[PDB]
Design a protein around this ligand. Structure first.
Ligand code: BLA
Ligand code: CL
Ligand code: MG
Ligand code: MG
Length: 281
């Protein structure tokens, strides 16, 4: 049960700071699927440095277990975004676990060395235990860190045990970053951190792979509501640019968003970072 990972994370967070209830708890807590057989459980909090810590947990009556757990920092704290997205069936697991970088780590080097230099060892430990998931939407790499755990594996006691240990080790590392995060003082830099987060939220609210599953469970209208106002809350408030403003490649011949998840196509059949965290893909 992924609920135990949520309990772990909330307990650990309250040893590094004090969580307060998010106002979203008044509008997003429990939601049944349309056929009433599956329950969506949602929690939301905030802290002095955390704009939104929220979780969605789904435990269906046929082996389906889903976890979407994220911590979004306030724009004054340029912390990575903690990201745990686990899609599990009775046999299969499709897993993304990462400290998503707020700013670009592809071309520039300052942000990458600021947050990930001391974490390469952690990424190396679990990249051996949870192998690269294979080819994936190329545009998604723009948001992944050198220590990302992208993996597919069949269910087993051993594999889920490794997954639990990875979540806990990665979340404790993120909390250690939070300890050291000092508030930004430059006003324009705060704006830059805010646009970077809004851009992140705009990508995922439009293209995150789990949206199809949510729409099947609770219908198009409520799914879009949960996506834009809970899971990626901030797409409406942190900026005015649209998805097509950030990613004009997706503008279709009709002026709408291209139905394709990936304009480039899926690539990177092998992990595109080496054992030292240098991008090689
Ligand atoms: C920057 C952010 C980021 C994240 C976290 C993410 C995860 C992610 N989920 C995937 C599959 C998948 N994910 C899901 C389902 C779910 N998945 C969930 O994370 C949840 C909460 C559900 C359920 C409601 C399913 C069903 C598949 C396989 C089918 C498909 O690929 O559409 C894939 C492989 C497919 C691809 O390459 O597109 C990735 C990279 N990708 C990103 O770009
Ligand atoms: Cl697939
Ligand atoms: Mg402790
Ligand atoms: Mg109902």
């Amino acid at each position: 049960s992924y609920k135990k990972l949520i309990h772990f994370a909330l307990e650990e967070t309250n040893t590094h700071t004090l969580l307060s209830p998010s106002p979203l708890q008044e509008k997003y807590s429990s939601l049944l699927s349309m056929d009433d057989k599956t329950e969506l459980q949602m929690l939301s909090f905030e802290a002095h440095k955390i704009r939104l810590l929220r979780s969605l947990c789904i435990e269906g009556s046929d082996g389906m277990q889903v976890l979407d757990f994220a911590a979004f920092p306030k724009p004054e704290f340029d912390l990575p975004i903690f990201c745990a997205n686990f899609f599990t069936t009775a046999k299969m697991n499709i897993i993304v676990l990462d400290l998503n970088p707020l700013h670009d780590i592809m071309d520039q080097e300052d942000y990458k060395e600021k947050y990930y230099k001391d974490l390469i060892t952690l990424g190396l430990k679990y990249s051996k235990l949870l192998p690269w998931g294979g080819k994936l939407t190329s545009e998604s790499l723009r948001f992944f860190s050198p220590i990302v755990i992208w993996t597919r594996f069949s269910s087993s006691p051993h594999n889920h045990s490794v997954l639990f240990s990875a979540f806990k080790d990665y979340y404790q590392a993120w909390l250690g970053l939070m300890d050291r995060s000092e508030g930004e003082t430059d006003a324009s830099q705060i704006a830059c951190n805010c646009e970077a987060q809004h851009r992140y939220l705009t990508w995922r609210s439009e293209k995150d792979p789990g949206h199809g599953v949510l729409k099947r469970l609770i219908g198009e209208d409520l799914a879009k509501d949960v996506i834009t106002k809970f899971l990626f809350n901030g797409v409406n408030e942190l900026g005015n640019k649209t998805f097509l403003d950030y990613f004009p490649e997706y503008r279709c011949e009709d002026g709408k968003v291209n139905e394709k998840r990936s304009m480039i196509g899926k690539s990177f059949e092998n992990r595109p970072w080496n054992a030292r965290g240098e991008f090689i893909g």
